[PDB]
């Protein structure tokens, strides 16, 4: 179902709040983003690792030079935090991702995995920043 | 679901400060910050 896959879909307005929050490689790794290829076609790529680009680009008011190691089944390359779409996982794109994973040999993550992963985002949102994260954030 | 937004001083950037938080700007470091205008109805019978 593409609708349940949209729960763990990371929109563009949520990455802006966690451009500098640590534990980034532990909460986003497992979710799916709607990255842009380009004409209105899209593919569901897999958030595998946290990479950093040497290109500093501004996303509205905030700016981030980091990259994301995305992969659509087999086709993997570097990506930036500006080409991600707020659009939810459509039916055609969902089936295309299913065929990319079935054609790649990757197992489809079990729905219980998505259920236990989607709550990580909400527990990270209401996290109290009592430790020394404000200082590294400002730095 | 309102996080009690403040305005910094030297920065003038809106910051989200909940209880049990240190009063500092999200950027550049600032221990002074003020509050936003109210949303209550402000009406002056001009006289």
């Amino acid at each position: 179902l593409p609708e349940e896959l949209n729960r763990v879909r990371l929109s563009r307005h949520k990455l802006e709040r966690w451009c500098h929050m640590p534990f980034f490689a532990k909460t986003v790794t497992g979710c799916f983003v709607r990255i842009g290829i380009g004409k209105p076609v899209y593919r569901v790529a897999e958030i595998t690792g946290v990479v950093e680009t040497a290109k500093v680009y501004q996303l509205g008011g905030t700016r981030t030079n980091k990259g994301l190691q995305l992969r659509h089944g087999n086709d993997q390359r570097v990506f930036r935090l500006e080409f991600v779409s707020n659009q939810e996982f459509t039916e055609s794109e969902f089936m295309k991702w299913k065929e990319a994973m079935f054609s790649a040999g990757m197992q489809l993550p079990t729905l219980d995995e998505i259920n236990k992963k989607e709550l990580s985002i909400k527990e990270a949102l209401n996290y109290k920043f009592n430790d020394q994260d404000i200082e590294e954030i400002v730095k | 679901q309102q996080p009690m937004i403040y305005i910094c001083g030297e920065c003038h950037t809106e910051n989200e400060i909940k209880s049990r938080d240190p009063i500092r700007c999200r950027e550049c470091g600032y221990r002074i910050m003020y509050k936003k205008r109210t949303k209550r109805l402000v009406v002056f019978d001009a006289r």
Binding site: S11, R12, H13, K14, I35, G36, I37, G38, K39, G60, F79, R80, E82, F83, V84, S85, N86, Q87 | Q1, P3
Partner: peptide
């Protein structure tokens, strides 16, 4: 105040650069 997109703010493409 979670995701106020209302679509969006013109999402740039990867193949457009």
């Amino acid at each position: 105040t979670s995701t106020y997109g209302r679509y969006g703010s013109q999402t740039p493409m990867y193949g457009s650069g």
